[PDB]
Structures are given as structure tokens and as C-alpha cells.
Amino acid sequence: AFRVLKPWWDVFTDYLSVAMLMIGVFGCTLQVMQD
Amino acid sequence: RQETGIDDIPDVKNDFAFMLHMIDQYDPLYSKRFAVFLSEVSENKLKQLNL
Amino acid sequence: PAYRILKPWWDVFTDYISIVMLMIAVFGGTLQVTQDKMICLPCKWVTKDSCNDSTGPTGIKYDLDRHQYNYVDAVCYENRLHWFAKYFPYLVLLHTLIFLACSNFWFKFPRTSSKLEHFVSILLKCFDSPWTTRALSETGVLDKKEGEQAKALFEKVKKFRTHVEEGDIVYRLYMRQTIIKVIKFALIICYTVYYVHNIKFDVDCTVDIESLTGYRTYRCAHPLATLFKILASFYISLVIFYGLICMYTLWWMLRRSLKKYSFESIREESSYSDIPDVKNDFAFMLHLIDQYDPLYSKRFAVFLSEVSENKLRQLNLNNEWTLDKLRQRLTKNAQDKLELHLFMLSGIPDTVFDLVELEVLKLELIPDVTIPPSIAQLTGLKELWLYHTAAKIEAPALAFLRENLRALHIKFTDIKEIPLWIYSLKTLEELHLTGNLSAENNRYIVIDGLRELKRLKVLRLKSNLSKLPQVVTDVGVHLQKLSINNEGTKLIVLNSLKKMVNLTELELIRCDLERIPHSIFSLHNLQEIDLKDNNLKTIEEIISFQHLHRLTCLKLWYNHIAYIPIQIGNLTNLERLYLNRNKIEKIPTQLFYCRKLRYLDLSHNNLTFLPADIGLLQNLQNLAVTANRIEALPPELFQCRKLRALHLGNNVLQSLPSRVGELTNLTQIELRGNRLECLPVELGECPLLKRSGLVVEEDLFSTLPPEVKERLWRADKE
Fold first, then answer.
1. How many CB atoms lie within 10 A of CB A2?
2. How far apart, in whole angstroms, are the C-alpha atoms of residue C629 and residue C82?
């Protein structure tokens, strides 16, 4: 239902998406604080 | 059809083919276990056993 | 979840080492984000673009604004700080992330993850199967439902063995991941320790900004540089531990060669010989689970045991059968003997041993069972029939059958299908054998133990033999009856048939004799004889049958006999005769000299008349002349008032003489196929006439009076 629809490339894209979300949020935080 | 000798499960439409390809990429055996209930000869076997 | 057991001890240790490394890297990163600064102060005496370092002391006044201090601090931090010193925590975080990705590589990859989840589920259920612990305890009565559960477990085990034993995929992926982890540890442990020295508390930067400041060289302080050195040492110590663990893993894997599971110690200890060594993608996982827990291996081994599977199937076989179904399955043969014929049945359900009323047991296509002692409970068994089974026996079973067996019948395609302990049964009296036992240069040698069967009396042979067996001839001293069915093969007596003088009956059907050897006449105790399908054309030798004073019956039917030799008139001792399926055309008067004749079957012949001497044969009671040229009936036919039943159908008989009423004992009559027009009224006055005993067409029967029909139907209902 939530796991069987995901091929390997789907998992890798999801991981890259999570990493990009972390990158964007961290960049926003750094711009807020120290920029 | 070659293995179980059941000439049924002839083909599918576009949507069923799409879903079946995605299942095969996820796992090559779940499609084999899923197509049994589409088999006509298997359905005959189940009907005969139940009867 | 349940994947805890998959991880080796070193896997958990790597997990926690990575956890610690990620924690310290995150702490270092968040500290560098906020509290990381550098404090810079210029140098006034600048020689060679460097700090020359040339009444209370007074403060040195650089006359610089705090904003200028901030600008120079930022510029010096950017230009003249080691990049590794600026990005150690982010690099460590990236390395932890890639380590985690490599660790969950095979785990987050669905291709192998499907195999892993199936394997862990099957291993879990095989460890916890109720039947596995029972089988281990065997070193019983079971539920049918648990039998189905264990049976489906065996089916899934076979399916999974077919599916994954071939693969060898997860092994390759884990090997690649281990290689990546080891080499990455080596790379980081190399370059990090190469560049560790660059993190120093004090730095000297000459960014050459004089249009804004006037100064050239600056000495600066990085407070966390000692702290970052501590973090680097701690992290690289963690890296050393991770690399030691990874090298241990890879070396153990290379030394192990776990593509085939040895599997011989467990089966050797438990004597479960059916525990074969499994191939790659099954041995590797088995070894990993053994690393977690060796016992889990054995808890699965018993379900790869074919002996265990067969035992479970036998338990299910015993569960299925109910004594009532065998009771309804008990039948009565033509010998009034209770029969339970087990056919194409996998094994013995011991419940069949409770019905002592079983008189005859017939076994066919039953795979090589062994008789348990409980057969001793079957008192009534006297005759046995085994068809194509190389069955074994137990000593109590052999002892019970040694005195509780009377007849035995075997139908075998191959010699080995005969158990060899047959010669130990001393109460055997009738033995029947079917199938080609013929061998070359050792024929009649496998059956040499018949001499041990002292009480053997009857013997039936269906083996297409061409020579009389020597052991059979020797054992014929106490045989009273011998039957041979060579079914096509011509047999030579070799004069060895006369040594069984005690013989009383002799049957040679389809033996293609084509002639009567003299030795047959030597059997003084012989009374009946059948020589069907021996292609007999001339039977004038019957004159020597004067030798047999107890010559009661004779059969030479299904032959070429077209004429009757008169010497049978000497054979007055005959009481029955059957020479049908021949080409006999006339009945000599001399045949009527055997007045003791009681039964005849001369059907399927060229006969066209009945001689008036039938009144001579007053002892006759049954005669068949079907498929002949009979169109006339003598009055003397009706002179035998004790004639019970007749088979006279399918002839050219125009009319039935009215003297049929003289047949007072006439019970059954066949007239179907006769060219009759009116049934005689005196046929309807016979006391023993019944519609069942009246085989005649309805149209010709309708010529009878209606009262005759009514009485016939009334006797049919009564």
C-alpha cells in the first residue's frame, strides 16, 4: 500500500529528496542566523 | 502458460500491464502469485474441487 | 522489527559506531555554525611580510574600529583557514551518511529485500512450528489441522528452496557493501590523519588589505581548534574501530566459503540423513543465522528432512482414515471372504489392523511399505494379494503370518518385488504368482525356496514360461493342484509333470501346447483338466485317459477341435465336458456312452442337430449350444426329466417341440436369437420356469398364453 509501489529508483529519489529538503532548511536557518 | 501449461491469462490492457511491470520491478514473484486468480483453468480446478 | 537476528554482532557494533560518529559530527557542525570565530590582531613591525615581534606597561593602540576588527576577522577566516579545519564535521556527516546507505543497501533494495523477508518469515515459522519440536523429540496422534499447517510449511519450504537456492544475489551485494565499507574506512583513516595537523589554535594571515586598514600581517586565534583536534582524534579512533570490525567481517567471510552449508554435523548427530547441503543464497543466510544462533539452523534442518516430511504425511494419512470408511470399504469376494483391497495408497494406516474380520487383503501399487507388528490383530486374514509392491516386514508380523496365513497371491512386474521372507511362511497352502519371472541362466532359481513351503498345495502361474521349473517340480510332491498360464508361450513338460502324482487338478490355459504330452496321463489322482487355447486340432489321445480312474471332468475348449474321437466312449467316468469355441459339426453316438455326464457347453460350433441318444445321458443337467446351426430338437431331448437349466439361444431353431413340458426340472432356458415363431404352451407349465430363467425375445414370448405370462410375472415378483 505504501511500500510495494516503490522501485529502487523511487527509493533513491526519495532519499535524494529528503537530503535536498535538509539542505534547503539548513540553508534557510543559516541565512536567518549568521548571514 | 509454458510452465503451468495453462493457456489462459492471455494478456492485459494498458493499466494492468503498467501495474504488472511495476510489480515485477518491485518483485518478480508476486506477479506469478497474483496471476493465478486470473487463470481460467485454475478457476476450473477450484470450481471442480469446491463442487 | 524482526530483522534483529539478521544482524551479526559486528553489524550492531558498526551501527552504534556510526551512531556515535554521526552524533559527534552533528555536534561539531552545530557548534561551528554559531560559536566558530577567529580573533585577529595586526602586527606593527612587519619584516619580510611577517610579524617581527619587536614604569608600568602600557597598552598597544592599533587605533582600529571594532567593525574593522570584524571585517579583518572574517577575511582572514575565509582566506587563510584550512578548508579541512572549516569542514571536518560536514565531511564526517557525509561519511556517516554513506556508511548508513551502504549498510542498508541490501535492506532498502527491494530485489533482495523480498528474498530476505520471505526467508525471515519462513525461518521464523519453521523455528516455531509445533511439528518441528515433535520431530526433534522423535530422535503418535496429531491434529488434522496442524497436519495441514506443517504440510503447507513443507510446501513453502520446497517453493523457497526452488526460488532462492539458485540466486546467489544477496551474497554478492553484501560482499560489495563490505568491500565499499573497508575501502572507505581506509581512505578516510588515511586522509584525515594526513590533514589532522592543519587544525591549529593560532594562525598567521597576510591578506594584504591596506587601502582599508593599512596593515599587512595578522595573528589570529581559533578557539575550537584544540576542541576540533579532540573531535578529530575521537572520530578517527571510531574509524579505526569500524575498520577493524569490517576487516574482521571480510576476512571471516573469505575464510568461511559459505556458498554451501556443510549441514552434515546436525544430520550426523540426529541421524536425519535427508538434510542435503544447500547451495549459495541459502548457505550464506544459514551461516549468518548460525552466527546469531546455531540452534535456529537445526530448527530449520528438520523441515528440510525428507524423512520428517514423509512422517508428517503418514500422520495425515492416519488422521484422514476412519474405521467406518474401511468398514464400508470392506467387501465380499466370490469366495465369501471380507476384502479390503488397498490400491494406490501411499502407506499403511494402522487403524486397518483393528478390523480382525478382514479375510482377504489385496494390495496394488502401494509403495514399499513395511508391515508393523499390529497385523497380529488381523485374525481372519487367510488369503493375501500383493500387486507390484516390494514391501518389507517385521519379525512379529512374520511370526504371525507364519501360522495365520493360508493363501498368498503376488502380482509383480519385477523379480525384486517378491520379498525373500516368503519361504519362512510355513502355513502357506495356495500361492498365486503373476508376471514374467523368466530369467536367463538363472530361471526358476529365484523361486527355489518353494521346497521350504511344505504345506503348499495350490499353485497358480502366469509367467509366460517355456520350461517347467525344477523347484516347482520338486515341491509338486505335496501339491494337489497346479495351474500354469503361459498366456501364449509354448511349454515343454520335459516329462517333469508326472512326478506330482498327488496332483488332482491341472490347468494349462493359453500354453500353446498343440498336443498332449504323455506325462499328463501319469497323474493317477488327476480328476479335472482344462487346456484352453492350446490350439488343439486332434484329440484322439483321450484313449489313454482310461488310465485315470477318477477322471471326473475335462476341458479342451477354445481350440481347433472339429471332430470328436469315438474313444471318449471309453471315458465313462466323465461327468462334465466343455469344448466350446471350436468347429464341431456332429455329435457321435459314442459320446453318449459317458452316461455320468452332467454339464456340457458346446456353444460356438458348427453343430446342426442333436442325436436321439441324448436320452442315454440322463445325468445331464446343463448344456449350451449357442452360436450353432441347430434347427431341430429331438423328442429324446425331453426324455431327461431332471434337466435343470439350458443355454440354447442364438440358433436357427425354427420351432420348439411341445414336449418341453416334460422338462419338469427346467429352471433356466436361453432362446434369444433362435428363429422361433411361437413358444410352446407346455413351456409355461414347467414348475421352475422364471422370467430370469427365460432368455428369449419379447415378441416371440408374446405368443405364449396370457395366463402363462401372468404366472411368470407373479413368480418373478415372488
1. 5
2. 129
| Cell numbers linked to C160 | 523457497
CA distance C101 to A11: 12
| Contact list, C74 vs chain A (CB under 8 Å) | none
Closest Cα in chain C, distance from residue B27 (Å): 6
β partners of residue C392: C370
- Which of C579, C581, C584, C583 is closest to C597 using CA atoms? C579
DSSP C644: -
Those of residues 158-177 in C touching chain B at CB distance below 8 A are 163
Q: Which chains touch C (3 or more CB pairs under 8 A)?
A: A, B
CA distance C26 to C32: 10
Determine how β-strand C360-364 pairs with β-strand C383-387: parallel
Q: CB count, 10 Å around CB of C403? A: 10
Q: Which three cell numbers stand for residue A25?
A: 532548511
Q: Pick from A4, A6, A8 the residue to mutate for testing the C interface (most C CBs within 10 Å).
A: A8
Residues of C near A (CB-CB distance < 8 A)?
33-34, 101, 108-111
- In sequence order, the 6+-apart residues with CB closer than 8 A to the CB of C320 are C144, C349
Residue C510 three-state SS: coil
Rounded to whole angstroms, the Cα distance separating C21 from C452 reads 87
Method: cryo-EM
A30 has a chain B CB within 8 A of its CB: no
Cell digits for C366? 502401494
Work out the minimum CA distance from A18 to partner chain B, whole angstroms: 21
Chains in contact with B, where contact means 3 or more Cβ–Cβ distances below 8 Å, are A, C
Nearest to A8 among C33, C101, C110 (CB): C110
Contacts of B29 in chain C (CB under 8 A): 114, 163
Residues of chain C with C-beta less than 8 angstroms from the C-beta of B36: none
Report CA dihedral (C57, C62, C64, C68) to the nearest 10 degrees. -110
**Residue C141 burial (CB count, 10 A):** 6
Instruction: Please answer whether residues C177 and C106 qualify as being in contact, where contact means their C-beta atoms are separated by less than 8 angstroms.
Output: yes
How many C-alpha atoms does C599 have within 13 Å on its Cβ side? 6
User: What is the number of other CB atoms lying within 10 angstroms of the CB of residue B15?
Assistant: 8
Distance, in Å, from the CA atom of C616 to the CA atom of C591, rounded to the nearest integer, reads 10
Q: Does A7 touch chain B (CB under 8 A)?
A: yes
First to last CA, chain B: 25
Residue of B nearest to C163 (CA): B29
DSSP helix/strand/coil, C695: strand
Query: What separation in angstroms does the CA of C297 have from each of C113, C121, C283, C293?
Result: 21, 14, 10, 8
